[PDB]
């Protein structure tokens, strides 16, 4: 519930030498619409010669997942900055929505590469339709046939306020 995917459409301000300017559309992941629009101008400034003071926003809409109850495999392309230089990566995730996949990606990059939110560009998010499109071995073991496994050494849940138990707890639940 931290992120949502938005559609943002923007335009250069019309002038007499060019009425009816072109329209550009981007897909932005953001926690709210105030930072969705700020993110839009950031990316457009890097591609076209437009600013916020010489343009305007046309439309903002929320894109919802079409089947948020079906398990899917996702692939993501991204570009990030390390302490010296920039690099490209491709990672994979398994969940039920595009928003869930992006949230897991941001946590994963912070843990394994110490990359902050401010140094990551998302290039493309694609749902992998065929089971033959899975590349990473940590996903392949999850799409194996006839999967099943037990849960050994499970610690029982005990109220914090209850100190001084009178029996030795078990771990076979």
């Amino acid at each position: 519930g931290r992120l949502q995917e938005y559609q943002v459409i923007g335009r250069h301000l019309p002038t007499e030498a060019n009425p009816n300017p072109a329209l550009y559309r981007m897909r932005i992941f953001a926690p709210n619409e105030v930072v969705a629009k700020s993110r839009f101008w950031y990316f457009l400034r890097g591609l076209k010669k437009v600013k916020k003071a010489t343009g305007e926003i046309v439309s903002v809409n929320v894109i919802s997942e079409k089947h948020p109850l079906k398990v899917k495999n996702f692939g993501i392309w991204l570009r990030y900055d390390s302490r010296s230089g920039t690099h490209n990566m491709y990672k994979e995730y398994r969940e039920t929505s595009r928003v869930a996949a992006v949230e897991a990606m941001y946590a994963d990059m912070a843990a394994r590469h110490r990359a902050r939110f401010r140094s990551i560009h998302i290039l493309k998010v694609v749902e992998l339709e065929k089971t033959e499109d899975v590349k990473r071995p940590y996903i392949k073991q999850l799409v194996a046939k006839n999967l099943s496994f037990p849960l050994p050494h499970r610690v029982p849940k005990i109220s914090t306020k209850k100190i001084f138990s009178a029996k030795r707890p078990s771990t076979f639940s």
Binding site: I158, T160, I163, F164, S165, A166, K167, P169, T171
Partner: protein
């Protein structure tokens, strides 16, 4: 939460530092505590790391006179545990001194506190806190290697008291077997409707 006259804690299998912080808070609240079997406490990590820690402690001493003021290094397992507790208490105040007066620590189980109920602090148990595959040591081994002299005396005494317990457990099993038989014979004797009223109430 519950207020008791005294709580007796069986020290086997508890992590040293976590049990120390819980015990310290109980004493400052106004609860009396007794800890037994202090030689069976646990410390996380390999034994060699614990040994190096104590040696660094041993090297500290007053320069101009080693009989006053200096850190006095106690060797017994119960005194190692007592040091950890005293660090989490304002022991230089009158309130702190009174709190420490509510605690007793022992090696083994002396005769006052056998034939008594021993509790457990699940927030400090090793089998519930430590990830399987990591390493741990016992305070009893560390004390033996820094100059504690009574490891074998305690080991022999503990064997004797467990042998007495085996006889006690034998009697306790017989009593339960007879009580179960009495409840069966008396159940189908008299109670025509008390049985169903109690069953509806949940008893």
């Amino acid at each position: 939460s519950s207020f008791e006259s005294v709580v007796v804690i069986d020290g086997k299998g508890h992590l040293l530092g976590r049990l120390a912080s819980i015990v310290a808070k109980q004493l400052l609240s106004g609860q009396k505590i007794v800890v037994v079997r202090c030689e069976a406490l646990n410390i996380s990590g390999e034994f060699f790391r614990a040994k190096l820690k104590y040696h660094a402690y041993l090297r500290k001493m007053t320069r101009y006179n080693p009989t006053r003021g200096g850190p006095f290094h106690f060797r017994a397992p119960s005194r190692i545990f007592y040091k950890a507790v005293r660090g989490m208490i304002p022991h230089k105040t009158a309130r702190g001194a009174a709190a420490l007066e509510r605690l007793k620590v022992f090696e083994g189980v002396p005769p006052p506190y056998d034939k008594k109920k021993k509790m457990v602090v699940p927030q400090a148990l090793r089998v519930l806190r430590l990830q399987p595959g990591r390493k741990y040591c016992t305070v009893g081994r560390l004390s033996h290697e820094v100059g504690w002299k009574y490891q074998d005396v305690v080991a022999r005494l503990e064997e004797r008291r467990k042998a007495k317990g085996a006889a006690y457990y034998e009697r306790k099993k017989l009593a339960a077997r007879q009580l179960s038989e009495a409840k069966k014979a008396a159940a189908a004797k008299v109670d025509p409707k008390v049985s169903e009223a109690l069953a509806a109430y949940g008893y």
